[PDB]
Amino acid sequence: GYSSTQVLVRDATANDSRTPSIDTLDDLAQRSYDSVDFFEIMDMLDKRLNDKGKYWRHVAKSLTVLDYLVRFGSENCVLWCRENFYVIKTLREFRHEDEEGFDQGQIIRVKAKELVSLLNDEERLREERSMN
Ligand SMILES: [Cl-]
């Protein structure tokens, strides 16, 4: 019941130890230029960026994807971040301490802050996107 693109975003953001690979990130960035794929990718990222707690890997990996898209995918990816800027900004405050006491949330907060900073700096983002 998944499109090819939906399988790819699901895998890229799964609750597992794998980090999204460069090949997958590039595939997603290239596919983001096709409108139908763009919406499928962003709808799944929306779901996963809004996860929490024990499922923080969904959030962290979706931020990894979203940053890659902002840098290398279609301009629509940037527009999406601006429309949904509130969600990204709240991730700066994401918390989760695991059973063994480790702060797993800090990685999400740092990533969110970096992305907020990039989105807030139009000239830097335009330059980054141009060289990419
Ligand atoms: Cl398909």
Domains belonging to the chain, first-starting first, are 1-132 (1.25.40.90)
User: Which experiment gave this structure?
Assistant: X-ray
7 CA distance to ligand 1 centroid (A)? 9
Round to whole Å and give the CA distance between 66 and 72. Answer: 10
Round to whole Å and give the CA distance between 9 and 65. Answer: 9
Token readout for 16 is 């597992």
How large is the angle between the packed helices 122-131 and 56-72, nearest 10 degrees? 80
SS3 79: helix
- What is the DSSP code (8-state) at residue 48? H
126 CA distance to ligand 1 centroid (A)? 31
123 CA distance to ligand 1 centroid (A)? 36
129 CA distance to ligand 1 centroid (A)? 28
In our burial notation (b when 16+ CB lie closer than 10 A, e otherwise), range 54-66 reads eebbbbbbbbbbb
Closest by CA to 72, choosing from 11, 132, 8, is 132
Name the residue type at position 67: D
Q: Does residue 116 contact residue 109 with C-beta atoms inside 8 Å?
A: no
Round to whole Å and give the CA distance between 132 and 125. Answer: 11
Resolution given for this structure, in angstroms? 1.8
